[PDB]
Amino acid sequence: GKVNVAKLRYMSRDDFRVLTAVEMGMKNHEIVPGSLIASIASLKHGGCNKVLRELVKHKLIAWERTKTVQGYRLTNAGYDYLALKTLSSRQVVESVGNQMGVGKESDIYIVANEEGQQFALKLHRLGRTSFRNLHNVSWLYLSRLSAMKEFAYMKALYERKFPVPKPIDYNRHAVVMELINGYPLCQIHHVEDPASVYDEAMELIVKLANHGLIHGDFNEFNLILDESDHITMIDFPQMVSTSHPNAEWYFDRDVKCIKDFFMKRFSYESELFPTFKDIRREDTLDVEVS
Amino acid sequence: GKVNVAKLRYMSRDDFRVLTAVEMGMKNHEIVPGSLIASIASLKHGGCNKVLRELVKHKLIAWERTKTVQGYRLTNAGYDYLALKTLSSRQVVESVGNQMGVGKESDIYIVANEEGQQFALKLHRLGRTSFRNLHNVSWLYLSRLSAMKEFAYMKALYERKFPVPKPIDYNRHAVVMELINGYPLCQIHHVEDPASVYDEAMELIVKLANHGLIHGDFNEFNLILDESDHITMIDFPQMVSTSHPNAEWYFDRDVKCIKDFFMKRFSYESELFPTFKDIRREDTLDVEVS
Ligand SMILES: O=C(Cc1ccc2ccccc2c1)Nc1ccccn1
Ligand SMILES: O=C(Cc1ccc2ccccc2c1)Nc1ccccn1
Ligand SMILES: [Cl-]
Ligand SMILES: [Cl-]
């Protein structure tokens, strides 16, 4: 057997309206008053409070009281559900499995469509830090923006024959993409030909730089090795322009990180590693993604 | 003499209201129609079109026509002016000098108050990349958010006796702080005692980690050495939680970057470098800044 996946909880037009109302409410309120939710949701029967209590019970929204405001906010599970239900209505996702990895700022899950074909889901989680020494609904917008940027870059890189997953669809903070069957490099113990995997990694750094991009977090946690020892890049959250005044330092750091890992894990060392002076710009993906 | 600084351009309350109206308009529009700007500004004498032409002439806004829409948007110079004029009305900034450094995502200028005391200004510049392979008012919000986070972290770190500049004030994408007199480590050729500067750098990585933070970009471009060979951190845009599943890799990368620089520039090497296992959490600045 393969990984277990659970069908998404059923969602009524009522639940979706109230849930959407809470989301809209959070543009202008850290805690959305129950009266504002009721008027935005405008249910035909106006048992809005019953529906909210039911959404609390299912952990999709949470109750909070400050000094002189009290009401509701979307939970991570609520935001997740809105994204996954939207993707479900486009026949992209039917079922969700357990978390089976992380990016720098994302959680990675296996999902399946109605036919039981498996895909990778990335849920972006930004705005985690709270600021109180001076608004903290930045997490909705920032997470949505990461997912959008990941989908756009993944599409642009895939079309330019880079070793990245085929992106399928996105909504809010959720990106669905080709599942890559293999192991992150960090949990590979032996390889028949380390030189070959090292070369793929170094050629990927060069090709990114030739397109105007430095990964910035290039490592054994972001690179998956498949059944035929080819690498796929699965996370690129904070890429730097080759035009940055300190671009060379970022480029060298990514190169040194790969060298350090290949020495530690495989006792492999080489002189076939790029310098920034080798880069010949061919594209402008740091300026515009098209 | 010291660095040249120029008094901020004079602007009438009318001109400043129209520029603020364009900014408000951009909450809901990539391109703000002239009619919407006029109704938001609501000038007593209604010469709004004259004022807009004058703001174009001074490069504070730009005119654009698409197929669907035609009107105005804030320029970088316009956003800069709004921030600096606001800081000017609080007596924080009277005069602006030339750019004299960069952070990873910010431009650094010398500014002066009315008495001619010099300070550092950081203008945050995010949302540089354009996405067209599928809204682009993200640059206002993201830049504002970087500045806010920098001010908050700088205050929290300063109060906890970290070697950072004393933060003074912020508005929009602008942060004003203590000017640190010295050289970025990257432009230091010799030091009497490299071991001592290396130790300060390594103790700073440990103290950050003890407070829940990994810098993530710790380098010779972010650290300024003053007249008495003490280091000050002047940029920390993308800090990582010590709770990150790959926290150890980020911590080690910051340590290796300092080691590599001290070997390259000063031929200095040491075994007095921290490991992640040494860290004993003392604070929660990765979760909440207070
Ligand atoms: O991470 C992986 C490797 C992997 C594959 C199956 C797994 C099954 C069960 C548990 C872990 C598993 C890990 N792929 C990946 C990552 C991002 C995007 C696309 N694909
Ligand atoms: O970067 C510097 C060093 C420095 C000082 C004076 C300069 C004058 C002319 C030219 C460069 C200059 C550089 N300080 C700093 C940075 C961020 C925040 C606060 N202070
Ligand atoms: Cl529905
Ligand atoms: Cl509806």
Numbering used by the authors:
A (entry chain A), B (entry chain B): 2 to 135, 146 to 301
Show passages lifted from the paper.
The RIO kinases (RIOKs) are an evolutionarily conserved family of atypical kinases that are present in all eukaryotes, most archaea and some prokaryotes. The RIOKs have the protein kinase fold but lack the sequence motifs involved in substrate binding, including the activation loop. All three RIOKs are found in the pre-40S ribosome, although involved at different stages of the maturation process. The deficiency of RIOK1 or RIOK2 prevents the formation of mature 40S ribosomes, and in yeast both RIOK1 and RIOK2 are essential for cytoplasmic maturation steps starting from the 20S pre-rRNA.
